[model samples]
Target: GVEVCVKAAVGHPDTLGDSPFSQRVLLTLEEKKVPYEMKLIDVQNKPDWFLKISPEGKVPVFNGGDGKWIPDSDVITQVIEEKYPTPSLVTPPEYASVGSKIFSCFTTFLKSKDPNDGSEKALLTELQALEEHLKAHGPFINGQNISAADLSLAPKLYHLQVALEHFKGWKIPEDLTNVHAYTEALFSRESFIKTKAAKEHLIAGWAPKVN
Candidate 1:
């Protein structure tokens, strides 16, 4: 109904922020082919009106223009999915958390200052799990269809790729053939390409977080 408004995180050069969560919401909107109006909010200096709708000062909030605003990516995506059910993005419950830990592990590894810290190993383990899954059930996270799970993980994986490569000169292991193929498939999707943050924004976003 009309163009829904999305208040997402603003970025380094004041563009679309490097928020995988916000990307998740946008991906859902794109997949559903919903018309949307994007309103970027500077997370560091949240305006009073934004804070009223989002008391936590977090972003990726959704407003359907019905005086109702929803916070958090999970909630907003679900709401959007419910509102626009065509070309459903619902993921089967069994495969929902398949590669969920990859992002956190990537972040831990990215912030590690010591080679002996084992965060790198931790990240590799997570990647390995995803690799195994891809070998068995991929091309996409939920087999053939690009479901909600893929949309959710693709943006995080992009961050993992861009941030890790930019900061530590790390790239996904070449041996993970299935994962490499899977990544290529996800990153190249029209929806992801349209919603992804710029590489510079990703690098700048992770700058303060890394030592």
Candidate 2:
């Protein structure tokens, strides 16, 4: 059998932690039905062997079963996609960056000390862009098929939703119905459910970030 190790970020007692980056890779593997082993890389104490393979000791590293450790979700996902193209998670060129800015916007807003700082406005602008896109072109990011774009955005959006609501009592506006529906669909997907971090872990993850 083809083999690989997916080193996902994890805190003690929890198999999944609060990193959307690793969740992206996990989503890809799950979606493509790739057979692999899940290895937990403790954020607090990364092992010596992990450091040997990944010089930076990053939270999520993919070992392709050839003794090569790959860092960065973008690179790892593309590698996985090429290696197994069955359901094809490739999005169109124009649509690839549709909701890309939302995550940054979300984090900016989440950490803002002032309610009037305009960070929330920036996040809303990005979400509205996604809302318009979904209204016109999606039930999923690449339309009918869930592509790499959706896989990428979905986890970040989950983080945004969890962190924002828990820290600021903020929620996505109800009028962005298309965006809400889109989030629902992605969050409810089997792959997403299996890979998402726990809400408690998510809240704790942002605890220090918010302060």
Candidate 3:
């Protein structure tokens, strides 16, 4: 058994599991059936100890079971899978590659200065691509099993779905039936619900006004 710890950014004390990157790490632990301590850090004023682990001060610094720690969401998740390989969670490079779009679609769009910036269009395109893939290749992102791709994308998609509705008065689109269904199915899972940010807190977290 490995000792696991995670540093997660909560926009405020009331919001746990808001950072998609942080929740991704937490969910991976859950998927692996491991117990971990989640250390909540406020990003707005990062404490010194957290910065010591990561000079650049990224959230989701993982204690890699050996007193060693590492940063970056993608790297930390991959390491966790590598170190604890039971009921394997890793999936194909293609699925992971496609999952990477969440940053551009969700995060970049959130921070964009221009109201009509192409981030929303880019976001829709990413979702459409995933919808097609799911319709053709999935009962899950890994076909028969939920794997890294599903874990990686699901949290981000959850944030995307909520953020769009909260900010733009939009939805995932009725035409994106497969994507919509996949998201609903995903959100329904106990693991997902346990790890997902509270929607109200998330909406407040993404806005400039921290509630």
Candidate 4:
């Protein structure tokens, strides 16, 4: 019974390429078919009103529809799934890192590699693990239903997959065919089409990291 407005960041002068966290929220809304309003916030220079709601100045805040608002994409997604159950992208407790790693890897990819910064390689290892998981499990991270695991992974991996291809001419290992299959199944979905940023925009959104 909770229909509320969602606040998420929009790229400067661009409608797409918001944070992966917000993109996941959008995916949840799309999958659940919940009617809601979106308030696109300017992340760099947030208005006071947005700060009041999410003082941390994060993307993807949600109104609870009862005089309260919630921050954190994971928490908001759970709230929504509990409220609207059909076609649920039920999340498992085991894949929590799938959600958190998006921004971590994104920032690492975009930033200059410090002497201590090794997240790019680390992130790829996670993908490798995921690839192995897919090979064993056969499709979708949380079994066959395309649950929160795929929803959480596909967006961040989309950025990594595309930007790495663009900047470094690298791709997910060809042998990780199950990962490729999983990505294709995910990329073809209407929800992904609606929420994902264009490839050029995603590449452009990167931080101009030095190769």
Candidate 5:
């Protein structure tokens, strides 16, 4: 069997906060029971091979066998879902459109410079909506089964917690109780535990100043 190889700088100093990208790829691999290897890239001095494969010179590229490269976390997830569909990452076509919209809101927050800023209130509002929706129909996003929406939201929520912790005195909203519980449920999964453990080890050793 040809294993997919994920090129990531998950533990490297220059890429400590890029867990969202790494986790996206990891969830897909885990959900599909796909065998893969994580090839850590040193972002401070990226390799020629990586540079060639990823024109953007980013972590979290996927190399499916035969040297085929897939860049962008979302695209990599899509490819994985298409190639290995046993545990589908996305809902059926109709639900996926709605899921994509919800995902975009969280994605914006994850990439924001100041996630807690007043301008980012919409992010929290969206999360509140998700929380309510989940309470009505969850244990997983979309429905009973975990899908791409859940996978996407997991890292964003994790990073949101990180951002909240980083900015002390910022109160976590009470409406986020369901969001926290949902995130905790996902974190309890073996895949998230393993990925987070690796990330925590890396951050503790690399980003001592802020961490």
Candidate 6:
């Protein structure tokens, strides 16, 4: 009976292709079966209602049943998961911590642009550790089930794939067979496909130079 609304530039280039922030929120909503409507924004000229709710002017804002607005993608996702727990996005706290660290390491990789830089190598090494962990306990990050960790890692991995393709000299470890397989499995989900479709549409319309 309650309505969940998301104010996101779900198909805006600045928010879609590059912003894992928006993508994560979209994934949470989709996974949780939260009945929601997406409001695509023009990043350069944000709408009045968006500015009203988020004075700081950010995308991926959520307005839930109580009429209170939630800003910040991660916070909003946590709230959604808490409110609707049928499909838990996180494992128990201890295991979730491992997921958090994995997410942090992924973010570091996504943020660093220099392939020649040691940070990239360090991040890949960190991913190699995750690859080992996955080999032991993954079709999903924490185990057999998809959780917040998978959602968090998905967009970043997609970005990594794009980056790897663009920067030919940068090589993701082929030895991490499990990690590669896991990534392929994750993206096959309908949620990822939907988000990717939105991302591709955004890229084509706004940043034609991106491809």
Best by TM-score: 2
Summarize candidate 3's per-residue lDDT along 1-211 as a digit string, tens digits: 3433333334564346477777788888888888777776766676787778768877677886677777777898889888789879889876767656755677667666677888778877888888888898886887888888888788888888888778767687899888878989988988898888778777777777411
Cα-based lDDT for every prediction: 0.82, 0.84, 0.76, 0.71, 0.64, 0.66
RMSD of each: 2.0, 1.7, 2.9, 3.4, 4.4, 4.0
- Model 6 scores worst on lDDT over the 10 consecutive residues at 202-211
Q: TM-score for every candidate vs. truth?
A: 0.92, 0.94, 0.85, 0.81, 0.76, 0.79
In candidate 2, the residue pairs with backbone N, CA or C atoms under 3 Å apart (3 or more residues apart, or in different chains) clash, namely none
What TM-score does prediction 2 earn? 0.94
Q: What's the C-alpha lDDT at position 59 in model 4?
A: 66
Model 3 has a clash total of 0
Model 6 clash count equals 1
Give the C-alpha miss distance for residue 114 in model 6, angstroms.
6.6
Task: For candidate 4, write residues 54-135 as lDDT tens digits.
Answer: 7887667787577777878789888888888889788667754543554466556545345357766776676677777777
Q: Cα deviation in Å at residue 204, candidate 3? A: 1.7
Q: Which stretches of candidate 6 lie over 4 Å from their true place?
A: 1-18, 97-116, 169-171, 197-211
Task: For residues 4-43, write the lDDT of model 6, one tens digit per residue.
Answer: 2333343453444445667788888888877776666666
Model 2 Cα lDDT, one tens digit per residue, 71-136: 889999998888889889998999989999999999999999999989999999999999999999
Task: Give the candidate order by descending lDDT.
Answer: 2, 1, 3, 4, 6, 5
Of candidates 6 and 2, the better by TM-score = 2
Q: What is the lDDT of residue 106 in candidate 4?
A: 50
After TM-score superposition, the amount by which residue 30's alpha carbon in candidate 5 deviates from its true location, in angstroms, is 1.3
Give the number of the best model, judged by lDDT. 2
lDDT of 1 by residue, 52-95 (tens): 87787766778876777777788887887788888878888988
RMSD of 4: 3.4
Query: For every model in order, what is the number of clashing pairs?
Result: 0, 0, 0, 0, 1, 1
